[PDB]
C-alpha cells in the first residue's frame, strides 16, 4: 500500500504517474477504494473545517502583516496621499536600487503596497490602530484553532455525525438562513451601529466601553416602542468628514442612498439598515422548512407538488429532492452557480457603489478588486458546470428522475446545445464583423463610416434609474412617474446626486463601444455556456460514444477509431471552456480597466472614439497603458513597477509554456523520455543512480490540465501585472 493509499489501483503503478495522480485524485473522495457514505461525508465535513481554518489563518496573516509591517495608522491619518502597505519585503536578491525603490509609504525598508482593499475595508468597519488589527489577528487565530479542534472532533467516533444528519436539508436550510445569513447580518448590524458608525463619527467604541457608549441618544427605547424613525432622525450631513465628530449626525439607521460626499462611498448608516433588513428577512425566511416542531415545509412534497398539469414539464420536479440530497455534486454545482452569480454581483456592485471609505479614490485597488471577483467567479461558475457534468456521470439516476425537468433536459439537450451554438455564432459574426468593419473604416481614413450602435436599451434602463443625460424621461428621470414620487422623499435625493455625477463609476455613460463589448461579453458567456452545457448534457453519452458514463468523468479519449475521439469527455469540455472563461473575463476586465482608465484621468472621449475598433484596444489600451509597465526596469535603471514588469514577462513565460502541453502531445515526449531513460541507464557514473518511479511522459488528461493551469497562471499574472502597473504607476 504505497502512496496514494486511497486508491489501490494507483499504488501498483510503477511510474511517475502514481506520484502525479495521487496529488490530483486526493480530494476526489468518492472515487477512492473501500470507500463508504459515512467516510465520504465526514471527510468532506473535516475538509470544510480545514478550509475554514485556512481562510481564517489567511485573514490572520493579512491582518498581522498590516498591523506589523504596514502603516495602517499613517493611512488612517491621510487615506488620499499614503499608499497602503501590505507587508515588508526581505529578499536576499535585491541590490541597493531595489531596496531604495521599493521603500514606499514612509516605511523603514522595502515594502509591498497593498492593492487588496483591506485598509479601506478595515477603516470603514472601525479598525483604527495597529493594536486593533493585532487583536483581530489573534482572535482569528483562535477562531481557526477552534475550527481545527472541531474538524478533529467530528472525525472522532464519539462525535461522528451520520449521513442522515448530513442529508437533513430542511434543518440545514433553517439554521443557515436563520443563523448563518440572519444572526450574522444582525451581528454585523450590531457592529456597524455600535462600532463603525461612532468610529466614523469620531467616538472610540471598543470592548472596554461597549456597555457604556450608547449608539443613539435614546437607545432601545424607540426600538421597542415602535417609533423606529428616531433611528433615522439626524443623519450625517454633506459637510461630514469621515472619522471626525464635526459635521456628523446621531441617526444609526438611515435610508439616504447614494454616496458619502467626501469618500465617494456608501453610508455606514445605510449599510447598517441594509443589514438589519437582510437580517430580519433572513431570520424570517429561516423559519420556512420543517425540522422538529410540526410546522414548516417538506421540500420533497414542494418539489412533488410543483408539476404543471398540462404536461409541458413532464413530471415537473418529482424525484428531484432525493436527486439533490443524494448527489453531493448537484449541491456543489448549485452552490457554485449561486456563488459565481454573486461573486460577479460582488464585482459589479463594489465599483459602481463603493462600500468602503476612500476605496473609490484608490484606482488600482478598485481595478484589482473587480478583476479578482470576475476571475474567481469565472472559475466558480465553470466549476458549477463541471460539477453538473460530474453529477450526470456519477450521480444522475435516470430511473429516479423519470420524465422530470432534469430528465427532460437530457430529452431536448441537442436543442439547447444547438441554440446556444446559434446564439454564440450570431454574437461572434456580428461582434467580429462590426469590430473588423470599424477597424477597416479607421484604417481607410473614414471614422464616420463605422456602424456605431447606441445601446439604447441599457441607456433606457439608466434613464429609468435616473440618468438625465440621454433625455428619455420615462420614470425616475421624469417627475410625472409614480415611482419617482414614491421615491423622491425617501432614497432618491442621495441616488440622483450619486448617479448624475460624472466622476464616479455609478452607471457610467455608455456608447457604441460599450454596445460592441457587451456583445463580446454575451459572446463570451454564450460560448462558455455552450461548451459547458454541451459537456454537462453529453456527459453520459452521445452519438459518437454512448457509454461516456461508464468511462468516468475525466477520461482522456476513446481511441483514433470512429473518426477520432479526442477531447470527447466532459472534463475536456470544461478544459476547453476554461479558455473561454479566460477570454470572457479578459474581455470584461479589458472593458472595465479601459472604461475606468479613461474615466479616472478625465478623457472619456478616448474610450468613446477608440473602443469601437480593435486597433484602439491594441494601441490606446494594450500599448498605451503598457508604457510604464515594461519600463519598470531598463538598462538605465529600475523603478518601483519592476516587480510588475517581471511578473508581466513571467506571465508570458508560463502561458506560453502551457502551449507546450496544449499543442505537443504525449507520445513524442514518451519516446523522448524513452531515449532519456536509455541515456541514464548507459551513462557511466550516472547509471549507479536508479529511479524507483519509471520516467514516463505526462498523461493525456494531466497534459491538458498542466497546459490549462499554466495558461491560467500566465493569463492571471500577465493581467495582474499589467493592470496593477498601468494604474498604479500612472494614478488616474
Amino acid at each position: 500500500s504505497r502512496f496514494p493509499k486511497f486508491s489501490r489501483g494507483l499504488s501498483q503503478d510503477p511510474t511517475t504517474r502514481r506520484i502525479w495522480f495521487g496529488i490530483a485524485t486526493a480530494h476526489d473522495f468518492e472515487s477512492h477504494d473501500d470507500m463508504t457514505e459515512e467516510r465520504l461525508y465526514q471527510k468532506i465535513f473535516a475538509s470544510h473545517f480545514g478550509q475554514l481554518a485556512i481562510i481564517f489563518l489567511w485573514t490572520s496573516g493579512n491582518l498581522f502583516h498590516v498591523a506589523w509591517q504596514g502603516n495602517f495608522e499613517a493611512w488612517g491619518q491621510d487615506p488620499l496621499h499614503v499608499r497602503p502597505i501590505a507587508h515588508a519585503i526581505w529578499d536576499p536578491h535585491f541590490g541597493q536600487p531595489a531596496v531604495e525603490a521599493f521603500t514606499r509609504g514612509g516605511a523603514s525598508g522595502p515594502v509591498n503596497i497593498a492593492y487588496s482593499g483591506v485598509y479601506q475595508w478595515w477603516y470603514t468597519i472601525g479598525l483604527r490602530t495597529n493594536q486593533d488589527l493585532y487583536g483581530g489577528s489573534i482572535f482569528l487565530l483562535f477562531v481557526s484553532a477552534l475550527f481545527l479542534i472541531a474538524g478533529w472532533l467530528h472525525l472522532q467516533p464519539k462525535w461522528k455525525p451520520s449521513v442522515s444528519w448530513f442529508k437533513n436539508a430542511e434543518s440545514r436550510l433553517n439554521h443557515h438562513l436563520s443563523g448563518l445569513f440572519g444572526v450574522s447580518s444582525l451581528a454585523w448590524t450590531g457592529h456597524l451601529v455600535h462600532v463603525a458608525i461612532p468610529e466614523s463619527r469620531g467616538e472610540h467604541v471598543r470592548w472596554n466601553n461597549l456597555l457604556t457608549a450608547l449608539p443613539h441618544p435614546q437607545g432601545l427605547g424607540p426600538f421597542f416602542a415602535g417609533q423606529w424613525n428616531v433611528y433615522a432622525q439626524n443623519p450625517d450631513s454633506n459637510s461630514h468628514l469621515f472619522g471626525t465628530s464635526e459635521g456628523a449626525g446621531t441617526a444609526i439607521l438611515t435610508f439616504l442612498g447614494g454616496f458619502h460626499p467626501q469618500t465617494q462611498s456608501l453610508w455606514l448608516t445605510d449599510m447598517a439598515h441594509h443589514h438589519l433588513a437582510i437580517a430580519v428577512i433572513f431570520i424570517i425566511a429561516g423559519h420556512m422548512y420543517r425540522t422538529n416542531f410540526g410546522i414548516g415545509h417538506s421540500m420533497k412534497e414542494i418539489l412533488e407538488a410543483h408539476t404543471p398539469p398540462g404536461g409541458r414539464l413532464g413530471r415537473g420536479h418529482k424525484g428531484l429532492y432525493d436527486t439533490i440530497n443524494n448527489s453531493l455534486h448537484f449541491q456543489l454545482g448549485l452552490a457554485l452557480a449561486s456563488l459565481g452569480v454573486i461573486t460577479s454581483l460582488v464585482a459589479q456592485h463594489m465599483y459602481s457603489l463603493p462600500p468602503y471609505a476612500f476605496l473609490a479614490q484608490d484606482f488600482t485597488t478598485q481595478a484589482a478588486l473587480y478583476t479578482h471577483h470576475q476571475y474567481i467567479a469565472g472559475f466558480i461558475m465553470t466549476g458549477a458546470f463541471a460539477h453538473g457534468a460530474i453529477f450526470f456521470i456519477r450521480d444522475y439516476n435516470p430511473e429516479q428522475n423519470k420524465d422530470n425537468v432534469l430528465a427532460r433536459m437530457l430529452e431536448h439537450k441537442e436543442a439547447i446545445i444547438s441554440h446556444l451554438s446559434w446564439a454564440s455564432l450570431f454574437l461572434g459574426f456580428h461582434t467580429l464583423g462590426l469590430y473588423v468593419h470599424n477597424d477597416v473604416m479607421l484604417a481607410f481614413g473614414t471614422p464616420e463610416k463605422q456602424i456605431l450602435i447606441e445601446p439604447v436599451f441599457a441607456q433606457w434602463i439608466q434613464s429609468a434609474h435616473g440618468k438625465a443625460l440621454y433625455g428619455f424621461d420615462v420614470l425616475l428621470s421624469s417627475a410625472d412617474s409614480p415611482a419617482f414620487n414614491a421615491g423622491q422623499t425617501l432614497w432618491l435625493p442621495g441616488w440622483l446626486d450619486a448617479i448624475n455625477n460624472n466622476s464616479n463609476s455609478l452607471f457610467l455613460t455608455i456608447g457604441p463601444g460599450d454596445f460592441l463589448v457587451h456583445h463580446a461579453i454575451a459572446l463570451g458567456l454564450h460560448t462558455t455556456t455552450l461548451i459547458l452545457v454541451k459537456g454537462a448534457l453529453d456527459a453520459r453519452g452521445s452519438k459518437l460514444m454512448p457509454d461516456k458514463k461508464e468511462f468516468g468523468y475525466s477520461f482522456p479519449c476513446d481511441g483514433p477509431g470512429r473518426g477520432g475521439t479526442c477531447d470527447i469527455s466532459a472534463w475536456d469540455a470544461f478544459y476547453l471552456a476554461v479558455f473561454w472563461m479566460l477570454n470572457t473575463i479578459g474581455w470584461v476586465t479589458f472593458y472595465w480597466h479601459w472604461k475606468h482608465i479613461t474615466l479616472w484621468q478625465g478623457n472619456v472621449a478616448q474610450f468613446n472614439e477608440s473602443s469601437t475598433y480593435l486597433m484602439g484596444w491594441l494601441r490606446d489600451y494594450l500599448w498605451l497603458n503598457s508604457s510604464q509597465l515594461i519600463n519598470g526596469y531598463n538598462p538605465f535603471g529600475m523603478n518601483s513597477l519592476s516587480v510588475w514588469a517581471w511578473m508581466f514577462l513571467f506571465g508570458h513565460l508560463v502561458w506560453a509554456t502551457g502551449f507546450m502541453f496544449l499543442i505537443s502531445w504525449r507520445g513524442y515526449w514518451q519516446e523522448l523520455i524513452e531515449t532519456l531513460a536509455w541515456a541514464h541507464e548507459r551513462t557511466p557514473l550516472a547509471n549507479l543512480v536508479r529511479w524507483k518511479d519509471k520516467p514516463v511522459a505526462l498523461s493525456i488528461v494531466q497534459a491538458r490540465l498542466v497546459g490549462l493551469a499554466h495558461f491560467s497562471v500566465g493569463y492571471i499574472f500577465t493581467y495582474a501585472a499589467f493592470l496593477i502597473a498601468s494604474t498604479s504607476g500612472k494614478f488616474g
Binding site: 435516470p398 430528465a407 437530457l410 430529452e411 439537450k413 441537442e414 481614413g445 473614414t446 471614422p447 464616420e448 463610416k449 463605422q450 456602424i451 456605431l452 450602435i453 447606441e454 439604447v456 436599451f457 441607456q459 433606457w460 443625460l469 440621454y470 433625455g471 428619455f472 456608447g511 457604441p512 453529453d538 453520459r540 453519452g541 452521445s542 452519438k543 454512448p546 472621449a605 468613446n608 472614439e609
Partner: protein
Amino acid sequence: VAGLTPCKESKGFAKRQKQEIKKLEGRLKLYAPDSAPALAINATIEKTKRRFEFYGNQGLLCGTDGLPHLIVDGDQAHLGEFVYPGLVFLYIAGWIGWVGRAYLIDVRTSKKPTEKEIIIDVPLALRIMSKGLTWPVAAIGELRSGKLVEKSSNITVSPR
C-alpha cells in the same frame, strides 16, 4: 434621442468633414493638378463630400465624437438604420436558407444523394433559386402544413 444631436447640426460631424478634405488637400499639394494620381484624390474628395452630405440628410444621430450612431430600437425616425435593411437582409438570408433547404430535399430523393452536393445540379439549383423569391409565403406555408419541421420520432437523437 439618447442624448445624440442630429448629424446635420452637429459641430463635431462638420469638424470631421473639414479635417478629412484638409488631409486629402495636403496630399494633393505634391502632385500636378492635371496628373493621373491627382484625379484619384479629387475623386476621393468628391466621394467624401457626397458621403457627409448623405449622412446628414438621412436624419442620422451624431454623438460627442462627431460620429453617426445607429438607433436599433425600432424608432419611427430611424427605420433605415436597422429595421429597413434588416428586413432587406432577412429576405435575402432567408432566400439563401430556403434554396439550400429545398435543394437538399430535391437531392435526397435521388439515386446518389452525395454526388449532388459535391457536384451541384445547376438546372436543379437554378430552378429553385428563382423559387426562393417568395419564401416567407413558402416557409410559413410549410410551417402551417407541417412540412417545415420533422417529428422527433424520425430524428437521430443521441442517448441519455
